[PDB]
Amino acid sequence: NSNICEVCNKWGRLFCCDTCPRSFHEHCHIPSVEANKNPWSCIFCRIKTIQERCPESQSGHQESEVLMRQMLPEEQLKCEFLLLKVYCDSKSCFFASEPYYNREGSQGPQKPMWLNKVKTSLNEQMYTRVEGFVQDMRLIFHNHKEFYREDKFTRLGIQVQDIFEKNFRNIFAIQETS
Ligand SMILES: [Zn+2]
Ligand SMILES: [Zn+2]
Ligand SMILES: [Zn+2]
């Protein structure tokens, strides 16, 4: 097993996956590492299994159809993993906790959003469709771009959104296009 957290790349109190070499802090893993279960398989393993049970799940899909799917167990897991993949980028630190807005010449967003909030929303099963989760994720970056305007700090929003969008296309097997 690895000696660092797959998500935050730090050592500490780690839980090890039984079916692959990754390890996690308790609250770095999404969902949080389960109290019992021997053996335990992490979310990367659980996602690989879904693909292996249904190879045709990797054929191209239309984003519009993916967004209308109901948050049944497998969609729920895919959204948890996609959220996890955003947290794996160190730049996610800017978007994790509740932001505040006091900058000359800007007004704060009408609907603030942040990754920990989305994490809680997923945990409490507040999303009924994939669309709900994806809208909140995209809102995070859109609020950032609008607030920071021409400051070069807007680029952090672009960078982290690209990570989200690439992983969204991979996980939900969106049809490749030019
Ligand atoms: Zn960690
Ligand atoms: Zn694993
Ligand atoms: Zn099948």
If one counts every other C-beta atom within 10 angstroms of the C-beta of residue 113, the result is 22
- What span, in angstroms and rounded, lies between the C-alpha atoms of 26 and 13? 8
Q: Which ligand is nearest to the CA of 57?
A: 3
Ligand lying nearest the CA atom of residue 56: 3
Report CA(16)–ligand 2 centroid distance (Å).
Answer: 8
Rounded Cα–Cα distance for residues 20 and 45 (Å):
7
Elucidation technique? X-ray
Secondary-structure class of domain 1-59 per CATH: alpha beta
N- to C-terminal Cα separation, the chain:
39
CA of 3 to the centre of ligand 1 (A): 11
CB neighbours of 30 closer than 8 A, spacing ≥ 6?
A: 43, 80, 81, 83, 84, 87, 119, 122
**Whole-number Å distance between alpha carbons of 62 and 75:** 15
Residue 128 CB contacts under 8 Å (≥ 6 apart), including other chains? 70, 71
Give helix then strand counts, H and E, for the chain: 7, 2
Give the homologous superfamily in CATH for domain 60-178: Bromodomain-like (1.20.920.10)
Residue 97 is encoded by which pair of tokens?
């906790």
Domain boundaries, the chain: 1-59, 60-178
